Design a protein around this ligand. Structure first.
Ligand SMILES: NCCc1c[nH]c2ccc(O)cc12
Ligand SMILES: NCCc1c[nH]c2ccc(O)cc12
Lengths: 212, 212
């Protein structure tokens, strides 16, 4: 309605977009994973396919407004394309990510943003032994592709992956799933890079729905 | 044992073998099945492979002896080739039976015989639906190939198939298995023939070893 139109116009039509973080003005991105399904393993290529929701949060001064000036609006939904978003990337993917949901963020009056896209990703993982009781463990790291820890820091709110929406009749059951902040280096550059390490231990489900 | 050698010589060396039953001298064969494994199903040919032990009992007057005359021997094992055996045949087999055990019978002084060969058999059975909770039912009839009920009658001691030796980690679990005496007629002949109807209801096993 009228007040929201005013707010979007004011935030988006009169100043250049935020040019991303810098050493002088770094940004911390909070990451969290909701693992929905391990869809497929490929033992001939050592690729495993996950469906997850990637919760991203961050805060920009440039996205702040006074609710009093905008009919007491305290937050709004807007296309992710309307705002700056962090280049958080899976470091061991083997196919382009497939986006399974709209890409729309919620912006709150204090400048904070919540963005949770659903994604399917193939990544590097040797699934040998998945059909046993002990299962198998794979790891996948997520971090900025181009910014070091001098510009983008990462944080999780919990080290436990959210499994409350995990598909109960998946071919695979989850034995454990953790998300932990780490600090990695790459050959291109000397600077400290930050990642979140997603560690999933899983095995073929042989109990529950479809099992009698 | 000298006494046993005498007995076998006296029984097997000095008279023509039993020419089989007749209308004037009919015979009753007791049958019982021990189902050990449902090994394989073939949904492209509608054949299923069973492993079972087939317990057969009958009694011949010509196999009697007085234990007093033979050092109190009341029974002995001997090769099934030494004695007459009934032509009990599976009527819906699709391959020759494969024998998995020695063929040796126990003969008792009253002329009674017990013979329990282990067998693998492929038979006519549509396995469609075996991977469901309801499973599938197949039936297999066993009886004399050439003797009518006027020469060979059949009997079971129980209508329950013995499942006490069924392979706990089979691909298939048994939902029920019965063995029931019936009467049948074939195009070739007007006389009633007797059979035992083996009816097995089963499904893919999804709870037990290999499952967690
Ligand atoms: N649809 C589940 C996640 C979800 C709930 N509310 C949202 C708002 C924005 C967003 O990107 C994601 C979400
Ligand atoms: N081996 C288990 C069946 C069995 C026990 N005793 C036997 C004697 C004879 C025979 O044919 C079979 C048996």
């Amino acid at each position: 309605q009228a007040n929201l139109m005013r707010l979007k116009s004011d935030l988006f039509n009169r100043s250049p977009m935020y040019p991303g973080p810098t050493k002088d003005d770094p940004l911390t991105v909070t990451l969290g994973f909701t693992l929905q399904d391990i869809v497929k393993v490929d033992s001939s290529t050592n690729e495993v396919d996950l469906v997850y929701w990637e919760q991203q949060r961050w805060k920009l001064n440039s996205l702040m407004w006074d609710p009093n000036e905008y009919g007491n609006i305290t937050d709004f939904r807007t296309s992710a394309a309307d705002i700056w978003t962090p280049d958080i990337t899976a470091y061991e993917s083997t196919r382009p990510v497939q986006v399974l949901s709209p890409q729309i963020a919620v912006v709150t009056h204090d400048g904070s943003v919540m963005f949770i896209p659903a994604q399917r990703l193939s990544f590097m993982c040797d699934p040998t032994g998945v059909d046993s009781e002990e299962g198998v463990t794979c790891a996948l790291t997520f971090g900025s592709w181009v910014y070091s820890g001098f510009e983008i820091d990462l944080k999780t709110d919990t080290d436990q992956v959210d499994l409350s929406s995990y598909y109960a009749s998946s071919k695979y059951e989850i034995l454990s799933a953790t998300q932990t902040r780490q600090v990695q280096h790459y050959s291109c550059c000397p600077e400290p890079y930050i990642d979140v390490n997603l560690v999933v231990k899983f095995r073929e489900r042989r109990a529950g729905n479809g099992f009698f």
